[PDB]
Design an enzyme around this catalytic site. Structure first.
Site, mmCIF file in Angstrom:
data_model
loop_
_atom_site.group_PDB
_atom_site.id
_atom_site.type_symbol
_atom_site.label_atom_id
_atom_site.label_comp_id
_atom_site.label_asym_id
_atom_site.label_seq_id
_atom_site.Cartn_x
_atom_site.Cartn_y
_atom_site.Cartn_z
ATOM 1 C CE1 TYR A 154 -7.056 4.759 -7.228
ATOM 2 C CE2 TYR A 154 -8.473 2.826 -7.020
ATOM 3 C CZ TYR A 154 -7.514 3.677 -6.493
ATOM 4 O OH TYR A 154 -7.051 3.470 -5.218
ATOM 5 C CG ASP A 202 -2.075 0.921 1.138
ATOM 6 O OD1 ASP A 202 -2.893 0.964 2.084
ATOM 7 O OD2 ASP A 202 -2.189 1.620 0.107
ATOM 8 C CE1 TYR A 259 1.434 4.257 -8.795
ATOM 9 C CE2 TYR A 259 0.181 2.703 -10.138
ATOM 10 C CZ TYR A 259 0.447 3.288 -8.911
ATOM 11 O OH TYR A 259 -0.274 2.902 -7.803
ATOM 12 N NE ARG A 282 0.705 7.109 0.969
ATOM 13 C CZ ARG A 282 -0.235 7.023 1.900
ATOM 14 N NH1 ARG A 282 0.005 7.448 3.132
ATOM 15 N NH2 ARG A 282 -1.410 6.485 1.602
HETATM 16 O O1 LIG Z 1 -2.214 2.700 -5.063
HETATM 17 P P1 LIG Z 1 -2.562 1.535 -4.012
HETATM 18 O O2 LIG Z 1 -1.793 0.199 -4.496
HETATM 19 O O3 LIG Z 1 -2.208 1.906 -2.626
HETATM 20 C C1 LIG Z 1 -4.397 1.147 -4.139
HETATM 21 O O4 LIG Z 1 -5.080 2.363 -4.433
HETATM 22 C C2 LIG Z 1 -4.742 0.086 -5.205
HETATM 23 C C3 LIG Z 1 -4.392 0.407 -6.668
HETATM 24 C C4 LIG Z 1 -5.174 1.311 -7.433
HETATM 25 C C5 LIG Z 1 -4.835 1.578 -8.779
HETATM 26 C C6 LIG Z 1 -3.721 0.947 -9.379
HETATM 27 C C7 LIG Z 1 -2.917 0.030 -8.629
HETATM 28 C C8 LIG Z 1 -1.788 -0.626 -9.241
HETATM 29 C C9 LIG Z 1 -1.506 -0.428 -10.628
HETATM 30 C C10 LIG Z 1 -0.406 -1.066 -11.243
HETATM 31 C C11 LIG Z 1 0.439 -1.916 -10.504
HETATM 32 C C12 LIG Z 1 0.190 -2.136 -9.128
HETATM 33 C C13 LIG Z 1 -0.911 -1.501 -8.490
HETATM 34 O O5 LIG Z 1 -0.906 -1.895 -7.171
HETATM 35 C C14 LIG Z 1 0.140 -2.745 -6.949
HETATM 36 C C15 LIG Z 1 0.580 -3.421 -5.783
HETATM 37 C C16 LIG Z 1 1.720 -4.261 -5.842
HETATM 38 C C17 LIG Z 1 2.418 -4.423 -7.067
HETATM 39 C C18 LIG Z 1 1.980 -3.747 -8.232
HETATM 40 C C19 LIG Z 1 0.838 -2.905 -8.174
HETATM 41 C C20 LIG Z 1 -3.277 -0.222 -7.270
HETATM 42 P P2 LIG Z 1 -4.959 0.502 -2.468
HETATM 43 O O6 LIG Z 1 -6.507 0.092 -2.608
HETATM 44 O O7 LIG Z 1 -4.142 -0.650 -2.019
HETATM 45 O O8 LIG Z 1 -4.905 1.738 -1.429
HETATM 46 O O1 LIG Z 2 -0.331 6.626 -1.553
HETATM 47 P P1 LIG Z 2 -1.625 5.689 -1.723
HETATM 48 O O2 LIG Z 2 -1.503 4.995 -3.182
HETATM 49 O O3 LIG Z 2 -1.746 4.687 -0.638
HETATM 50 C C1 LIG Z 2 -3.194 6.736 -1.787
HETATM 51 O O4 LIG Z 2 -3.690 6.892 -0.449
HETATM 52 C C2 LIG Z 2 -3.006 8.133 -2.439
HETATM 53 C C3 LIG Z 2 -2.016 9.125 -1.780
HETATM 54 C C4 LIG Z 2 -1.963 9.304 -0.367
HETATM 55 C C5 LIG Z 2 -1.053 10.220 0.201
HETATM 56 C C6 LIG Z 2 -0.187 10.976 -0.620
HETATM 57 C C7 LIG Z 2 -0.213 10.824 -2.040
HETATM 58 C C8 LIG Z 2 0.669 11.610 -2.858
HETATM 59 C C9 LIG Z 2 1.900 12.109 -2.330
HETATM 60 C C10 LIG Z 2 2.766 12.894 -3.126
HETATM 61 C C11 LIG Z 2 2.426 13.205 -4.462
HETATM 62 C C12 LIG Z 2 1.211 12.722 -5.015
HETATM 63 C C13 LIG Z 2 0.335 11.930 -4.225
HETATM 64 O O5 LIG Z 2 -0.749 11.606 -5.006
HETATM 65 C C14 LIG Z 2 -0.603 12.152 -6.249
HETATM 66 C C15 LIG Z 2 -1.427 12.111 -7.403
HETATM 67 C C16 LIG Z 2 -1.022 12.784 -8.588
HETATM 68 C C17 LIG Z 2 0.208 13.495 -8.613
HETATM 69 C C18 LIG Z 2 1.031 13.535 -7.457
HETATM 70 C C19 LIG Z 2 0.626 12.861 -6.271
HETATM 71 C C20 LIG Z 2 -1.140 9.886 -2.606
HETATM 72 P P2 LIG Z 2 -4.464 5.760 -2.776
HETATM 73 O O6 LIG Z 2 -5.841 6.026 -2.301
HETATM 74 O O7 LIG Z 2 -4.278 6.116 -4.339
HETATM 75 O O8 LIG Z 2 -4.108 4.205 -2.625
HETATM 76 MG MG LIG Z 3 -3.272 3.284 -0.907
#
Ligand SMILES: O=P(O)(O)C(O)(Cc1cccc(-c2cccc3c2oc2ccccc23)c1)P(=O)(O)O
Ligand SMILES: O=P(O)(O)C(O)(Cc1cccc(-c2cccc3c2oc2ccccc23)c1)P(=O)(O)O
Ligand SMILES: [Mg+2]
Ligand SMILES: O=P(O)(O)C(O)(Cc1cccc(-c2cccc3c2oc2ccccc23)c1)P(=O)(O)O
Ligand SMILES: O=P(O)(O)C(O)(Cc1cccc(-c2cccc3c2oc2ccccc23)c1)P(=O)(O)O
Ligand SMILES: [Mg+2]
Lengths: 294, 294
Positions: free
Chosen positions: B88, B35, B49, B39
């Site tokens: 997403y 997770d 990504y 960020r």
């Molecule tokens: O960004 P997070 O991985 O924190 C989460 O938004 C789930 C998610 C949303 C959208 C895209 C992905 C994503 C996309 C490409 C690759 C990978 C992703 O999540 C993982 C986890 C571990 C390995 C590869 C990837 C994950 P979460 O539900 O676990 O908070």
């Molecule tokens: O980091 P996670 O992938 O766990 C998530 O909480 C989203 C998030 C939480 C806290 C900080 C950020 C973050 C921090 C620095 C830069 C940027 C972040 O999210 C974006 C989106 C688009 C551009 C820059 C950033 C994103 P999620 O809901 O997408 O899983």
């Molecule tokens: Mg997350």
């Protein structure tokens, strides 16, 4: 209204005001195991053991309920104990009997309108002895006699560690009689005897770990670990925990991170790289007792 | 032999030596959710990504397995995501497909002899779309093709938050065909597709909370919470966590407390009364991000 109350105010508020906030914002369901009984007694009391723990338990349950929490789930006895001495086992059943027969706690259940329930594999695991069969009868009886109470719910966990086999058997019987599988709601009603929402928080102590509230755990169950045993729980500690859960765990509104300055995202990056190996849950041992570091 | 290794030595030991200790003392099963992907990327990388997260994930899984842990349970996608944008959602399914089709990870599974499994309610909750049906097929396929691997087991959690209804239906079908309820072992084999022992530890980050490893939690599942997201996991941090679990959580031998000096029991009493309101899990918020205090 209650959305911007500060922690300072929250800590200063009258009990009745905190209760109203909790009744409205939650936690609705809190897990509070009673453990560390022996060390608490020998450390903070040293009259009679069982009675000291009983009254202390009431004090804390009273505190929890008076802070507005509707349901408290309290694991009190787990499998481990059957592997302890016989005298230790009898001691346990006596404590179990107390929760269901002792006058002062029965008065407590009535005064605060608490419906008491027991969950776990105790009907199968409790000694087939006379004392054991008596405890089961007492448990069933208390659950029925307090079912008219509606202000609070108290679920005592007696060997309530793994509900898998219990859920399996319950589902099979339910399908047999109903013709369809039970819903999640029905599975919970079958295990706890009544429907209970997922736990909103768990307050343990010492080693970071959770246990004995099957089916009710969620990523949204906020976890807390005090340094001292359950019985030490103070007013201040509870309020700081309640405040964290209500206002901090799920902060709103969230910011648009893609819209943060270069410095903000830089200060944040430093908050994570500051202490690169920082981890909560690693501890140190003193006199055989584990304490969390940092 | 390995019973009195000090943390300093543990931290200095060659990787292969740590692995031997873990293979022998545990943890056998560790939960490590991925997770904080977004960020982490924007903070520690800012190429692509999905690929960055994929390789980083492999790095950490490789680390976990090379430290001797037999089974890693990794929740990677939970219900929440179906309530997010469509783009997403597609993004998620692409990541899911990666874990099962991407060449570099398939090579990883082969080189480290990892059997991969998927658990959760994804067969029911995944979009009925073409992409969704493809992901399910990919998951089933990978589980079969890697079943000959025996060194390590990797369980990916896709909507694996509440197995109650799943256990219920599995038990009903099992009783129908077998004439008797399934055992706990069989229930687990039915949910994870294979038998897996209870989790020995869970390593999360940020807010203290656990999720997505149904049936495998126990009071013996040691909990840890790093300050930074999963992907930041360093060598040092992992070893301090492993050391705490193996040597400190269950300290042996224990002392005869009824035999401790008046001073010892007094120093202990002070360790608990020192900071009477001390509690781990209460935090503070910075830029919408929660950080544990103390
Ligand atoms: O960004 P997070 O991985 O924190 C989460 O938004 C789930 C998610 C949303 C959208 C895209 C992905 C994503 C996309 C490409 C690759 C990978 C992703 O999540 C993982 C986890 C571990 C390995 C590869 C990837 C994950 P979460 O539900 O676990 O908070
Ligand atoms: O980091 P996670 O992938 O766990 C998530 O909480 C989203 C998030 C939480 C806290 C900080 C950020 C973050 C921090 C620095 C830069 C940027 C972040 O999210 C974006 C989106 C688009 C551009 C820059 C950033 C994103 P999620 O809901 O997408 O899983
Ligand atoms: Mg997350
Ligand atoms: O405190 P808990 O009741 O959780 C238990 O760990 C036992 C225990 C753990 C740690 C310290 C102590 C302790 C501390 C101070 C004095 C004494 C303790 O145990 C005894 C027994 C007999 C006389 C004095 C003390 C007891 P348990 O296995 O009996 O539940
Ligand atoms: O001493 P602990 O309560 O920590 C424990 O040993 C269980 C136990 C063993 C032997 C006696 C008791 C006991 C005896 C009398 C009253 C009460 C007992 O435990 C509780 C909990 C809450 C209220 C009253 C009592 C509990 P544990 O399995 O929970 O570690
Ligand atoms: Mg105890």
């Amino acid at each position: 209204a209650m959305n911007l109350v500060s922690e300072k105010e929250f800590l200063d508020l009258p009990l009745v005001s905190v209760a109203e906030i909790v009744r409205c914002r939650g936690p609705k369901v809190s897990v509070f195991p009673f453990d560390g009984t022996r060390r608490w007694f020998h450390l903070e009391c040293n009259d009679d053991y069982q009675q000291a723990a009983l009254r202390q338990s009431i004090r804390i349950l009273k505190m929890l309920f008076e802070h507005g929490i509707e349901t408290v789930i309290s694991p009190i006895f787990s499998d481990d104990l059957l592997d302890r001495g016989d005298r230790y086992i009898v001691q346990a059943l006596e404590g179990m009997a107390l929760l269901a027969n002792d006058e002062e706690i029965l008065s407590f259940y009535k005064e605060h309108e608490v419906h008491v329930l027991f969950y776990g594999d105790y009907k199968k695991r409790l000694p087939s002895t006379a004392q054991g069969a008596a405890v089961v009868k007492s448990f069933d009886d208390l659950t029925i006699s307090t079912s008219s109470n509606t202000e609070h719910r108290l679920c005592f966990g007696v060997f309530g560690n793994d509900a898998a086999e219990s859920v399996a058997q319950f589902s099979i019987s339910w399908n047999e009689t109903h013709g369809k599988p039970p819903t999640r709601r029905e599975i919970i009603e079958g295990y706890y005897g009544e429907y209970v929402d997922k736990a909103d928080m768990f307050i343990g102590f010492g080693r970071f770990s959770t246990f004995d509230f099957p089916l009710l755990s969620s990523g949204k169950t906020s976890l807390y670990f005090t340094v001292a045993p359950s019985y030490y729980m103070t007013e201040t500690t509870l309020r700081r925990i309640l405040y964290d859960h209500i206002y901090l765990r799920h902060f709103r509104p969230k910011p648009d991170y893609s819209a943060m300055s270069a410095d903000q995202l830089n200060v944040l990056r430093n908050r994570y790289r500051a202490q690169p190996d920082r981890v909560f849950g690693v501890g140190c041992v003193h006199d055989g007792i584990w304490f969390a570091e940092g």
